[PDB]
Write an enzyme that holds these catalytic residues in place. Structure first.
Site, PDB file in Angstrom:
ATOM      1  CB  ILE A 252      44.158  54.598  33.624  1.00  0.00           C
ATOM      2  CG1 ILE A 252      42.794  54.715  33.864  1.00  0.00           C
ATOM      3  CG2 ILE A 252      44.852  53.358  34.268  1.00  0.00           C
ATOM      4  CD1 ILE A 252      42.058  53.899  32.906  1.00  0.00           C
TER       5      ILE A 252
ATOM      6  CD  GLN B 252      46.949  63.689  34.797  1.00  0.00           C
ATOM      7  OE1 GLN B 252      47.761  64.194  33.999  1.00  0.00           O
ATOM      8  NE2 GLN B 252      47.101  64.279  35.983  1.00  0.00           N
ATOM      9  N   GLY B 253      41.774  63.961  32.639  1.00  0.00           N
ATOM     10  CA  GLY B 253      41.486  64.987  31.707  1.00  0.00           C
ATOM     11  C   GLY B 253      40.664  66.048  32.137  1.00  0.00           C
ATOM     12  CB  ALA B 254      38.875  68.761  30.407  1.00  0.00           C
TER      13      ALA B 254
ATOM     14  CG  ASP C 241      31.874  61.950  19.816  1.00  0.00           C
ATOM     15  OD1 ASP C 241      32.264  61.937  18.544  1.00  0.00           O
ATOM     16  OD2 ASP C 241      32.506  62.183  20.700  1.00  0.00           O
TER      17      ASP C 241
END
Length: 293
Positions: free
Chosen positions: A27, A29-31, A140
């Protein structure tokens, strides 16, 4: 780096996680890493699994801090951290999965009423009071980091930026937060405390009213300047809000940190007493989910 690996290897459960999980769907695929949804073989529970190749993680201490904080600060209003595994330099972090997407999907696709907003604010404040009481600042807070269950449950996530304070060093100075949601003191001073999370909650409330935080379409560098020089942001249509909601917002968004409400104080606010049952959110969550795919 070898020490980081050894520390991680003390933290994680042993072996390979695939014993445990069936039915991986990708779901994300980031850094940050690759994220799967999957199913726990033993419990039947649906989980979200983050896979990371440690060779390409620049700040691995953050990951260790995130796991250690999550492990020792479990709470019903925080997305449950379940387990972790390390296979060579491949790290797996397993979290519970919430099938209702994020608050961001809701605020951008639907229109919340004040009773629904109050419920969400209350649940977030429950998380914040617990964290703050434990000397943890999330740093955050924003709608993307508020996850929802199909049933309307509200949970905070992503401790990759959190801070642990002490009586000796009770304030922090690092700028790690997302600019549109940052408290002005983060940029104007070199010390801030837990109440930066309260300011961010207020901005989130603005998201729930107007669909966006103030200054969204400004360059982030500029928004930071505007936040610091404008102070308490102004609503488009203040008259449309109840007096008690306006008061709650004023308390979250106070410029003077001493005057700004603490999570404990805010939990007693009469705005939260208009909260609808959490299941009232279910139709919005369903609609947002459909809208987003």
């Amino acid at each position: 780096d070898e020490e980081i690996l050894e520390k991680l290897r003390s933290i994680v459960s042993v072996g390979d996680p695939k014993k445990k999980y069936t039915r991986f769907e990708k779901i994300g695929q980031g850094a940050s890493g690759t994220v799967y949804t999957a199913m726990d073989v033993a419990t039947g529970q649906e989980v979200a699994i983050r896979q990371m190749n440690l060779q390409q993680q620049p700040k691995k201490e953050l990951i260790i801090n995130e796991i250690l904080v999550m492990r020792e600060n479990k709470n019903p209003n925080i997305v449950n951290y379940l387990d972790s595994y390390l296979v060579g330099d491949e790290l797996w972090v397993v979290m519970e999965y919430l099938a209702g997407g994020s608050l961001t999907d809701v605020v951008t696709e639907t229109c919340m009423d004040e009773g629904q907003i109050a419920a969400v604010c209350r649940e977030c404040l429950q998380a914040l009071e617990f964290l703050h009481s434990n000397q943890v600042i999330h740093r955050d807070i924003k709608s993307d980091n508020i996850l929802l269950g199909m049933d309307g449950s509200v949970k905070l996530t992503d401790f990759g930026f959190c801070a642990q304070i002490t009586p000796e060093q009770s304030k922090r100075s690092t700028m790690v937060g997302t600019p549109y949601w940052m408290a002005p003191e983060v940029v104007t001073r070199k010390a801030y405390g837990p109440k930066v999370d309260i300011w961010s909650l207020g901005i989130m409330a603005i998201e729930m009213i107007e669909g966006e935080p103030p200054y969204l379409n400004e360059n982030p560098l500029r928004a930071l300047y505007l936040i610091a020089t404008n102070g308490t942001p102004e609503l488009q249509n203040p008259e449309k809000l109840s007096a008690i909601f306006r008061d709650f917002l004023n308390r979250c968004l106070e410029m003077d940190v001493e005057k700004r409400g603490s999570a404990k104080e805010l939990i007693q606010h009469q705005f939260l007493k208009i909260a609808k049952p959490l299941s009232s959110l279910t139709p919005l969550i369903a609609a947002a989910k459909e809208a987003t795919k």
